[PDB]
Amino acid sequence: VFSVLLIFIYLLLMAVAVFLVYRTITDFREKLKHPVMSVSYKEVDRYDAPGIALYPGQAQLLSCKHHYEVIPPLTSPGQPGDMNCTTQRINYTDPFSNQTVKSALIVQGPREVKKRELVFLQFRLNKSSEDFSAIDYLLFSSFQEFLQSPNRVGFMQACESAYSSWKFSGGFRTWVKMSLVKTKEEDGREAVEFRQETSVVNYIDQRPAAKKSAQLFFVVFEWKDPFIQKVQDIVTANPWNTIALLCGAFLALFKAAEFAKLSIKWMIKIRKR
Amino acid sequence: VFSVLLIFIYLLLMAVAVFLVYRTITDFREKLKHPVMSVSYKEVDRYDAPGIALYPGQAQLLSCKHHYEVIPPLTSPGQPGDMNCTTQRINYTDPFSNQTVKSALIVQGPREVKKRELVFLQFRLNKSSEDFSAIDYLLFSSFQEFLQSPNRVGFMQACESAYSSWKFSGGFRTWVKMSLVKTKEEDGREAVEFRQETSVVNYIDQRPAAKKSAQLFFVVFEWKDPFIQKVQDIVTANPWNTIALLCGAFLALFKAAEFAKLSIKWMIKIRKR
Amino acid sequence: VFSVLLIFIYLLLMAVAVFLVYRTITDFREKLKHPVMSVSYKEVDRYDAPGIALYPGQAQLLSCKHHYEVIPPLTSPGQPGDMNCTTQRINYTDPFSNQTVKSALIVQGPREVKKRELVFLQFRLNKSSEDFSAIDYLLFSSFQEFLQSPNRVGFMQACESAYSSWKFSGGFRTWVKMSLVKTKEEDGREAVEFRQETSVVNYIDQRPAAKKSAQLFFVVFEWKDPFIQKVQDIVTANPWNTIALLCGAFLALFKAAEFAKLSIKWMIKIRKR
Ligand SMILES: *[C@@H]1O[C@H](CO)[C@@H](O)[C@H](O)[C@H]1NC(C)=O
Ligand SMILES: *[C@@H]1O[C@H](CO)[C@@H](O)[C@H](O)[C@H]1NC(C)=O
Ligand SMILES: *[C@@H]1O[C@H](CO)[C@@H](O)[C@H](O)[C@H]1NC(C)=O
Ligand SMILES: *[C@@H]1O[C@H](CO)[C@@H](O)[C@H](O)[C@H]1NC(C)=O
Ligand SMILES: *[C@@H]1O[C@H](CO)[C@@H](O)[C@H](O)[C@H]1NC(C)=O
Ligand SMILES: *[C@@H]1O[C@H](CO)[C@@H](O)[C@H](O)[C@H]1NC(C)=O
Ligand SMILES: *[C@@H]1O[C@H](CO)[C@@H](O)[C@H](O)[C@H]1NC(C)=O
Ligand SMILES: *[C@@H]1O[C@H](CO)[C@@H](O)[C@H](O)[C@H]1NC(C)=O
Ligand SMILES: *[C@@H]1O[C@H](CO)[C@@H](O)[C@H](O)[C@H]1NC(C)=O
Ligand SMILES: *[C@@H]1O[C@H](CO)[C@@H](O)[C@H](O)[C@H]1NC(C)=O
Ligand SMILES: *[C@@H]1O[C@H](CO)[C@@H](O)[C@H](O)[C@H]1NC(C)=O
Ligand SMILES: *[C@@H]1O[C@H](CO)[C@@H](O)[C@H](O)[C@H]1NC(C)=O
C-alpha cells in the first residue's frame, strides 16, 4: 500500500535532515580548526588623514605641499621653501635592535581620495657614506591618533612591527598609490596594514654640475582608490553568529526528530490496520 | 511529570527560533546600514582587448609591437619602424582643470593572457623643459567600447575620473602586469579599475653620445593573470536575494509561532489532566 | 469568518516557501553556469621556504645572505664572498620556444615572516651585449618540493607556465615584498601564484671608475605579510556542500507541501461547516 511508501519517504527525509545538520556541524568544525578569514571592501567618501613616518637620517626636508591631481613645475629644485603640512618629529628606540634610535618625521597624509589629493615631499641630502640612496617610510593610519597618543614611543614601535615599511630612492620621483587594509585578529586587536603601487620616474637635473653631488629625493603620496579592505573571520569575530548557527543546527535536529516521530506514528498506524 | 519537561523544551525552542530570526534581522540591519562589498574572482580564457591611453605630449611613438613571452633584441634603438597595432588619437579637455586639453594616444592592449601577450611601445623625446622624464598612462577596459563610443570625449573624461592612472619613466623599460577589477556600485553603475605590478629595468644606451640627449621610453603591457576581481555587495546587487532573506525570516517567525502554539496546546492538555 | 483568513495566510506562506526554494535553485544555477571564486585569507606563523628561480645568464652570483630586518653596509661592493644559502642549478628547455634552454639558479627563500627575514643576493655581470640590464626571477612555493621532485625539469616548466615571473634591474637594489596566492581550480589542481610589491633604490657606486663598466645587481626578497590568499569556489570545491544545498532545497519543498496540505485540510474543514 501507500503506507510503506510514506514510511520510506519520511525515513529518507529524516536521513536528509540529519545529513544536513551533520554537514553543518562538520563545516563548523573545520572553520574552527582552520581559522580562515573573509575579505570585504568598504567605500568611504573621505579617508582618515594617515601618518607617514619618514626616516631621512641626515636628509633635510626641503619642501612638503598638498596638491590636487597636478604638481606644478618646480621653480628651483634643490632649494628649500613653502612648507605647508603638519609634521612632527619623534625619537624612539628600534623595537628589534634596541641599540639604534630611529628618528622619525611624521607627516599628515592626503585626505581627499575622490579629488586625488597629493602629498609631495622634497628632500636634499648633500653628503653621505651610504652605498644606496634611499629614505625609509612607514605608513600608518590616523595621524591624529598618533598625535593624540600619550607615549608616542610605544605607538611608533607597534607601527614598526606592522608590515607597512618601504623605501623610496633618490634621484627619482616616487608616485605612491597606497591602499588600506584593516584586519580583525583572533585576539580582536585591529591590525592596520598598507599596500602600495609605486611609479618610479627618473629625475633629470638641469642644475649646475657643481651642485650635482647632492642627492634629491622626491616622493608623492596618494590614495589609490576609496576602497578599504577589511579582513576578518565571520565565525570568530561574531560570537552571536556562532550561537545562531548552533541554534539553527539544534532546530534542524529537532525537525529531524519530528519527522522521525511522524514516521513512527505512520508505521504504527499501518501496523494497526 | 514529563508534561512540564515538554512544555519547557518547547518554550526553549520558541526562544531559540525567535532569537535566530532576530539575529538574522539584526545582521540584515547592519548590512544595510554599513554597506560592505564582497570580493570574488572570475577566470576567463581570453581577456577583452583593453585600451591604454598614453599621454606622450611631445614624445613621438617610435614603435608598437605585439609579442609572445619574449621581446627580441632591438635592431637599432632610437629609430622608428614597424608599427603593428591599432591606435587612435583623441583630444579632450581635462575634467578637472578645464583649461588644459589632454591629447591621448589610445592603444589596443594585449588579449591572450594564457600566452603572455606583450604590447611593447617605444617613444623618443628629443628635447623638453620638464624636470621629470615621464609619460602618463591610463588603463581602461574594452578598447572596442571606446572606439565604438559616440562622443569619445565624455568617455575619456569618465575614464580619467577612474583610479587607473600611472606614469612610466624614460631611460627605463617598464614591465607592467595589469589586473582588472570590476565594481558594482550602489547605483548599479559599473566601475572599471586597474591594479598593476611594475618591473623597472635600467636601459643601457650604446648609441653614440651625440644622440644621447634624446630620451627613450620603453613600456611593456601584459596581463598578470586570468583572474578578474569582481567587487559587489550581495544584499544590494540582488534585490531578489533580499526579498528571499525577508521571506525566510518570516518563515522562521511562523515556525516559532507554530512551536509556541504546540507548547500552548501541550500546556492545556497537561492542565486538563 | 477567520477560516478564509487562515486559508489565505497558508496559501501566502506556501507561495513564500516555493519562492524561496525557487530562488535558491536559481542562484545555484547561476553559480554553476557562472563559475565564480571566493577569496579568503589564512594567517600562518612561519611560511614554507619558497624557491626563487633566478636567470642570471652570464651574471655571477657574488653573494647570498640571510638577514633580519637590516642589511649591514657592504664591506666591498663588487667582490665575491660569504655565500650562506642553499642553492641549486637546473637546466631545462623553455616550455614555449623549445629551442633555448633556460639555466636557472634556485635559491631558498625567506622563512620567518614575523621577523622580516631577508634574502639578499648580489650579482656582478662584467660585460654583455644586451641593451637592457635585467635578471629574470620566477617565484614558486616550497623549494623543498622542487628539491624533492623526481624530474626537476617538468616542475620548472610547470612553474614557468605560472604567472609569477618578474625582472629586477642592475644598478639598483630591489626590495621585493612577495605574497602567496593559492588557487583551487575547477579541475582541483593547486595553482601557486605570487604577488609582489617592489621598492627600487638607486645604487651609488664609489668604486674606482676603471671597474665601473661591470654591472651590479642587488635584490632583497622578503615576505610582505603572514597572509596567504586562498581563491576557490565553494560550490565546486565542496561537493558535500552542493549535496547539502540540494537536500535543503528538497526540505524546503517538502515544508511547502506540508503547508499546502494544512491549507487544504483547513479549507475542507471550513467547507464542511
Ligand atoms: C602652510 O599652509 C598651511 C595651510 O594653508 C598654513 O596653516 C601654514 O601656516 C602655512 N605655512 C607657512 C609657513 O605659512
Ligand atoms: C632626536 O635625537 C636627535 C639626536 O640627538 C636630536 O638632534 C633631536 O633633537 C631629537 N628630537 C627629539 C624630538 O627628541
Ligand atoms: C632590548 O633592549 C635591552 C636593553 O635596552 C636589551 O637588554 C635587550 O636584549 C633588547 N632586546 C632585544 C635585543 O631583543
Ligand atoms: C648640506 O646638507 C647638510 C645636511 O644637513 C647641511 O648641514 C648643510 O648646511 C647643507 N649645505 C648646503 C650648502 O645646503
Ligand atoms: C602591422 O601588422 C598588422 C597586423 O599584422 C597589420 O594589420 C598592419 O597593416 C601592419 N602595419 C603595416 C604598416 O604594415
Ligand atoms: C589635437 O590637438 C593638437 C593640437 O592642436 C593637434 O595637433 C591634433 O591634430 C589634434 N588631434 C585631434 C584628433 O583632434
Ligand atoms: C569647467 O570649464 C568651465 C569653462 O570651460 C569653467 O567655467 C568651470 O569653472 C570649469 N570647472 C572647474 C574648473 O571645476
Ligand atoms: C626630435 O623630436 C622632435 C619631437 O617631435 C621632432 O620634431 C624632431 O624631428 C626629432 N628630430 C630627430 C632628428 O629625430
Ligand atoms: C653558510 O652558512 C650556512 C648556515 O650557517 C652553512 O651551512 C654554510 O656551510 C656556510 N657556508 C660556508 C661556505 O661556510
Ligand atoms: C647547464 O648548461 C650549461 C651550458 O652547457 C653548463 O655549463 C652547465 O654545467 C649545465 N648545468 C647543469 C646542472 O646541467
Ligand atoms: C617543442 O619542441 C619540439 C622539438 O623539441 C618541436 O617540434 C615543437 O614544435 C616545440 N613546440 C612548440 C614550439 O610549441
Ligand atoms: C668578469 O665576469 C666574467 C663573467 O663570468 C668572468 O668570467 C670574469 O672572470 C670576470 N672578471 C673579473 C675580473 O671579475
d(CA C16, CA A267): 31
The answer to whether the Cα torsion of B137, B138, B144, B146 is positive or negative is negative
Half-sphere exposure of B215 (CA within 13 A, CB side): 23
Distance CA A80, CA A63 (A): 6
**Nearest-neighbour CA in chain B from A86: distance (Å):** 26
Of C1, C36, C3, whose CA–CA distance to C269 is shortest?
Answer: C3
Instruction: Check CB contact under 8 Å for B241 and C19.
Output: no
Whole-angstrom distance, CA of residue C232 vs CA of residue C238 = 10
Distance between CA atoms of B191 and A41, rounded to whole angstroms? 14
Grid cell listed for A125: 641630502
CA distance linking residue A246 with residue A210, whole number of Å = 76
Contact C138, C155 (CB under 8 A): no
Task: Write out the three cell numbers for A100.
Answer: 639604534
- Check: CB of residue A269 under 8 Å from CB of residue A17: no
| Interface probe, candidates C70, C202, C222, chain A, greatest A C-beta count within 10 A | C202
Residues in Cβ contact with B79 at an 8 Å cutoff, skipping those fewer than 6 apart = B62
User: Any residues with Cβ below 6 Å from ligand 5, and which?
Assistant: B 83-84
Scanning the structure block, which residue is given the C-alpha cell 581570453? B46
Chain A: residues touching C (Cβ < 8 Å): 13, 16-17, 19-20, 23-24, 27, 34-39, 96-97, 130-134, 163, 166-172, 183, 193, 195-198, 200, 215, 231
Q: What is the DSSP letter of C83?
A: B
* CA of C110 vs chain B CAs: smallest distance (Å): 21
Separation of CA B247 and ligand 5 centre (Å): 59
Residue B267 backbone class (left: φ over 0; alpha: ψ -120 to 50; beta: rest): alpha
User: Whose atoms come closest to the Cα of B58: which ligand?
Assistant: 8
Query: Distance (Å) from the C-alpha of residue C173 to the closest C-alpha of chain B?
Result: 11
Phi and psi of A88, rounded to 5°?
-135, 155
In angstroms, this model's resolution equals: 3.1
Chain-centre distance for alpha carbon A209: 44
Deposited experimental method? cryo-EM
Output the CA–CA distances (angstroms, integers) from residue C43 to A140, B28, B259, C47, in the order listed: 21, 28, 43, 10
Integer Cα distance of C28 and C17 in angstroms: 17
Say if ligand 6 is within 6 A of residue B89 CB: yes
> Does C84 sit in the ligand 9 pocket, CB within 6 Å?
yes
* Cα C120 from Cα C109, distance rounded (Å): 10
- Cα distance between residue C163 and residue B117, in whole Å: 12
Q: Give the chains touching A; criterion: ≥3 Cβ pairs < 8 Å.
A: B, C
Closest to B73 in 3D by CA, of C167, C131, C57, C125:
C131
Note the maximum CA span of chain B: 113
Question: Do residues C36 and C28 make contact, with C-beta atoms less than 8 angstroms apart?
Answer: no
